Design an enzyme around this catalytic site. Sequence first.
Site, PDB file in Angstrom:
ATOM      1  N   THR A 206       0.835  -1.192   0.000  1.00 22.46           N
ATOM      2  CA  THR A 206       0.000   0.000   0.000  1.00 22.46           C
ATOM      3  C   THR A 206       0.873   1.247   0.000  1.00 22.46           C
ATOM      4  O   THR A 206       1.899   1.282   0.688  1.00 22.46           O
ATOM      5  CB  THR A 206      -0.912  -0.006   1.238  1.00 22.46           C
ATOM      6  OG1 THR A 206      -1.624  -1.292   1.199  1.00 22.46           O
ATOM      7  CG2 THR A 206      -1.954   1.063   1.253  1.00 22.46           C
TER       8      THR A 206
ATOM      9  N   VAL B 250     -11.493  -6.955  -0.601  1.00 26.22           N
ATOM     10  CA  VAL B 250     -11.230  -5.514  -0.725  1.00 26.22           C
ATOM     11  C   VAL B 250     -10.881  -4.994   0.662  1.00 26.22           C
ATOM     12  O   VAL B 250     -11.655  -5.237   1.631  1.00 26.22           O
ATOM     13  CB  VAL B 250     -12.473  -4.749  -1.218  1.00 26.22           C
ATOM     14  CG1 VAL B 250     -12.210  -3.253  -1.324  1.00 26.22           C
ATOM     15  CG2 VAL B 250     -12.986  -5.284  -2.562  1.00 26.22           C
TER      16      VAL B 250
ATOM     17  N   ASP C 254      -9.091  -1.509   3.036  1.00 26.90           N
ATOM     18  CA  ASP C 254      -9.534  -0.147   3.253  1.00 26.90           C
ATOM     19  C   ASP C 254      -9.133   0.814   2.154  1.00 26.90           C
ATOM     20  O   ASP C 254      -9.742   1.893   2.077  1.00 26.90           O
ATOM     21  CB  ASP C 254      -8.995   0.380   4.607  1.00 26.90           C
ATOM     22  CG  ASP C 254      -7.486   0.318   4.664  1.00 26.90           C
ATOM     23  OD1 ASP C 254      -6.875   1.395   4.805  1.00 26.90           O
ATOM     24  OD2 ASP C 254      -6.900  -0.756   4.516  1.00 26.90           O
TER      25      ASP C 254
END
Lengths: 134, 134, 156, 156
Positions: free
Chosen positions: A1, A30, A32
């Site tokens: 991320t 999925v 955040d």
Amino acid sequence: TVGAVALDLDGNLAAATSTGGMTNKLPGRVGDSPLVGAGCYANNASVAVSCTGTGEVFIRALAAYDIAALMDYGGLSLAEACERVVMEKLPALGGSGGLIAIDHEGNVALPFNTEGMYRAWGYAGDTPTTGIYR
Amino acid sequence: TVGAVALDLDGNLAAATSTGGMTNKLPGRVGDSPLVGAGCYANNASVAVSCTGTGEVFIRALAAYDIAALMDYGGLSLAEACERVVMEKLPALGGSGGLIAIDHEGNVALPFNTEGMYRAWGYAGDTPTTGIYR
Amino acid sequence: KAVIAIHGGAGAISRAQMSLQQELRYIEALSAIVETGQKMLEAGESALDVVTEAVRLLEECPLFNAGIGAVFTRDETHELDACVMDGNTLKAGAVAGVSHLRNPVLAARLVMEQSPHVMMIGEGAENFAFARGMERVSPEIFSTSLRYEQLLAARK
Amino acid sequence: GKAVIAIHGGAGAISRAQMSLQQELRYIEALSAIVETGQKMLEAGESALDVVTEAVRLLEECPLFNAGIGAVFTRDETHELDACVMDGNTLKAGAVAGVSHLRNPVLAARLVMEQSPHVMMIGEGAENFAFARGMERVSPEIFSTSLRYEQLLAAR
Ligand code: NA
Ligand code: NA
């Protein structure tokens, strides 16, 4: 991320987040990162936030928007809100990770409850700071 | 879009939302219903909420969690929080629709800013109330 | 004091375009579903089970845009989404973009109950559900003439 | 307050006993290069929205970070990518989830924001919208790196 937050010379705040998810992820899961208020939030009246951590907990806790509500409704400072969400509320739900945030006044916070978070920041025209551990 | 909120005899709060989307929708579009904090939220310390409306604005405004944050951080009552979100904040963003909500005290609210909202509610042991128009 | 509230959607209602027969069908449906939930609460069923059943019924009812009776997309398909959240644990389950599951709300509850995730989408959500016993259905099962006529009016 | 930027490249997957100094140096170099580009854009008067978009595009292009090129592998040996952007001025936002054929998920997200009335798109529907707007279709092979594949096999 990965993520970025910024305050520009006109007083505007923005945030962005992108990820490949997790190694060995279940296809179709999925976390955040693409969810407004969970992994990314920006509002000129309060704060710009981009998160990175245990996806499921940042969603259940609506971490990015929670920083903003804590500040806007709770009157907390950016630092108090970050402290409460990252250092108390998320570990209480089994969550680990961190976030970056800039408030409408220009305060910057890069809290994390893990051993490390790849991160960097700086004011325009100034020398940037980079970090891995600590 | 459809939804339900409930307070049980043990004090637990729960929320659920389900939708087919919009007629002639662009394939792949996602509105607020499946997003935690936008179209569905529940927390025993505050409120259970299910929303229905112009999906994009309930996501941008995190409508379901905002009721919770206004109450929990802001000290607003359920009705005050519902009024602020549905009658002031959403229409300011160009949003139409409403929500159903029950707080941890058993207060119930069914606000909407549209011509109608199919709805019903009732305490256990009482006769139910149903509604379509204002 | 236990209590339930339900909704069938805001926005698509205009007294000028509705008929009394229409309005009574909706009132009747809303009555029966809320009554089922009230009875469940008085019997000591959990909040979570009540909202799950209530939305399941609303999905099954073809009058409401969820499950059977879902609207049509641009491509004359159905794409369904649902969420459920437990205010006790703060756990939640959600699916989006599914078309082969009859009751999305039950698939959402399956995500929250039988996985460590919160949100699943599309065919991955469907394969997860199927692997745990949820039946595969054809999305034709959601189609109604009333919603198809709305689609054609939309392409006006 | 003056203009300022912060970036991140992920929390959690970092252990000093498992890192080497040449690896740490590469990370510091990449973080510094990208945050510097953002700083100079802010100094030049670019918008907060353009800055965060560019910074995350650069982090996607960089194979060191798990986003875009360099993305981890799912259990099916695929890549599924997700991204979001939000403008604090208008409170508009754009997001994509579960895309595999778009080189830069954050640019797709901005495209949802800038060139649609919507906020979130998923899966093939998200990819088909982006192609229709002129975004290029890429092979998901382009995100693949040996380092992340070995990590998948090691997890196995
Ligand atoms: Na239905
Ligand atoms: Na990358």
